[PDB]
Amino acid sequence: LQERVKELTDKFSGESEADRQKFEALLAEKNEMEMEYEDKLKQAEERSQ
Amino acid sequence: LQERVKELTDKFSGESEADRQKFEALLAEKNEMEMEYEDKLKQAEERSQ
């Protein structure tokens, strides 16, 4: 009986941690491409002037 | 035996499920500002010409 507590706690928490890592990677991906666009706006403006 | 199993399974899996909606919202947020930045680049070049 007591083993059932350990089995469900570890794997589902890992599932929560695994889904958290994707969220962190997506946040890094979103932030990385955000500044990439910001570079594009200024480069076009500088060439325009 | 069953009481704990259903208790831990439901609450711990919900934490993993809760990280998916945040991931989906982050993905939707990431896609949305990408279109805005593309519009910004499109409008920045139009005035340049």
Side-chain angles (χ1 to χ4, degrees), chain A residues 1 4-5 8-9 12 15-16 19 22-23 26-27 29-30 33-34 37-38 40-41 45 48, chain B residues 1 4-5 8-9 12 15-16 19 22-23 26-27 29-30 34 37-38 40-41 47-48:
Chain A
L1 183 148
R4 289 304 289 112
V5 172
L8 304 155
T9 308
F12 282 111
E15 294 172 23
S16 301
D19 294 331
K22 295 177 187 175
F23 182 84
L26 183 59
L27 186 60
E29 177 189 349
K30 170 204 158 198
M33 61 79 71
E34 187 169 8
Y37 270 116
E38 291 173 358
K40 294 175 185 175
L41 277 296
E45 185 174 12
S48 171
Chain B
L1 176 74
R4 305 162 301 106
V5 165
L8 280 72
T9 304
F12 274 121
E15 312 152 7
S16 64
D19 313 326
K22 296 175 188 174
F23 184 85
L26 182 58
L27 186 61
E29 181 187 350
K30 163 202 159 200
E34 187 168 7
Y37 268 116
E38 291 168 359
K40 288 179 184 175
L41 278 168
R47 59 88 174 173
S48 170

Side-chain angles (χ1 to χ4, degrees), chain A residues 6-7 12-13 24 31 33 41-42 45 49:
Chain A
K6 270 77 75 177
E7 294 141 23
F12 282 111
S13 74
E24 294 171 0
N31 299 338
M33 61 79 71
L41 277 296
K42 71 175 193 291
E45 185 174 12
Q49 291 169 6

